Amino acid sequence: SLVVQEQGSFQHILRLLNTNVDGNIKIVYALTTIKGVGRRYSNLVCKKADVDLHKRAGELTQEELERIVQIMQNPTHYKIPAWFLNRQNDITDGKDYHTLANNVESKLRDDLERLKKIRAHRGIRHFWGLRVRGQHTKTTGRRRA
Template identity: 50%
Template sequence: MTSEFRKMIRILNTTVDGDRTIYAALASIKGIGFSLANAVLKKAGIDRYKRAGELTDEEISKIEEVVRNPAMPSWLFNRQRDPVDGKDYILVGDEVTLAERRDISVMKKIKCWKGIRHSLGLKVRGQRTRTTGRSGRTVGYSKREKG
C-alpha cells in the first residue's frame, strides 16, 4: 500500500493526471462521464474531492472492481441492451471505440439508412448538407478581381 503522491496513475488501462480530483480524473476516461464517476466513487466509498495521485493501490483496485461488476441502475451504463446478448454494460477506453466500430459495420452490412450515410461519408443524424460539411473547394463564393 503506497501513500506517497504520484503525478500519473493508471486506472482502467488509462493514464490519469494525479493532480486532478479523482472525480474529474475518472470522468476523463473514455466511457465514464461525471454521473457515472460520482456513482462509482460513492459505491467504492472514496471521497470525490481527493486527488487522484493520493489514491492507494487498494482504492484503485476497488474502483476498477466497481466498474467491472457494477451494482447500479442500468440507466447509468453506456451500453444498454447490447445487440449480441441483450445485457447492460459499462464499456471503458478502447472497448467503447471497438463497440462503436462494430455497430457501424453492422449498419453498413444491413444497408439501413444510417449505414448508407456512413458508407458515403455523409452526415448521419439529419443535419443540413447543402452548405455545411463540405470538403475540398469552396462552392458558391468567388473573390472579386482587383482592378
C-alpha cells in the same frame, strides 16, 4: 480548515484500464479522461466506493483503486440502476453492459460495419462520411476534414 503536510506515497499520473489517468487533479474529474466514463458515472462510482471526493486522485493508495475499477467493469453488482449504463440491451445478448476504455470505440466500429454490411441507410451514410441524424447538409459541415 486543516492542512496535512504531504505523504511520501503521492504519485503523478497512473495506470487504470490501460488508460493514462491524469493525476494532480480531483478524482471525479480524473476518471473522466477514461473513454466511457463521464462526469455522472465517475461521481457515482466514487460515491459507491466510499472514497472522499475532496481528495486529489494523485494521492490514493492501492486498495481503493482496483475497487473503483471493479465497480466500473461490474456496475450492476454494486447497485447501479442500469439506466446509467452506456450500452444496455446490447445488440446480441439483451443484457445491460457498460463499455469502457478500449471497448467504446470497439463497439463503435462493429456497429458501423454491421450497419455497413446489413446495407441499411445509416451504414451507407456513415460509409460516405455524411451526417446521419437528419441534419441539413446544404450549408453546414463544409470543412469536414
